[PDB]
């Protein structure tokens, strides 16, 4: 959806948005897994355990 500019990022002596992007990718993967497990009605106990 959004494309940033990697030119001024490494020059401003700050990692920042890189770690934020990695953590957001982790959260989005967790959310996609939760959504995929919720689209089915296998077992609520499995959802609780996950």
């Amino acid at each position: 959806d959004i494309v940033l500019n990697p030119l001024g990022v490494p020059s401003r002596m700050n990692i920042g948005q890189i770690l934020e992007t990695h953590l957001g990718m982790a959260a989005k993967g967790i959310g996609d897994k939760i959504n995929a497990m919720l689209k089915q009605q296998q077992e609520v106990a499995k959802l609780r355990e996950f």
């Binding site: 770690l19 934020e20 990695h22 957001g24 990718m25 982790a26 959260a27 967790i30 996609d32 897994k33």
Partner: protein, 50 residues
């Protein structure tokens, strides 16, 4: 811990995945750092600034 959380959500531990261009469909040489972020915006309205 970030790599562990990425591995939990069934994601690569490197946090850098290659993409496909929406114009030609060619694969890039080096992978791309993608993920979810939280963007904000000031007032800065072009309707008022212009």
């Amino acid at each position: 811990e970030i790599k562990e959380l990425l591995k939990l959500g069934d994601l690569p531990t490197s946090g850098q995945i290659r993409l496909y261009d929406g114009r030609t469909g060619e694969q890039f040489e080096r992978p791309v750092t993608v993920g979810y972020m939280y963007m904000l915006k000031l007032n800065h309205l072009v309707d008022d600034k212009m």
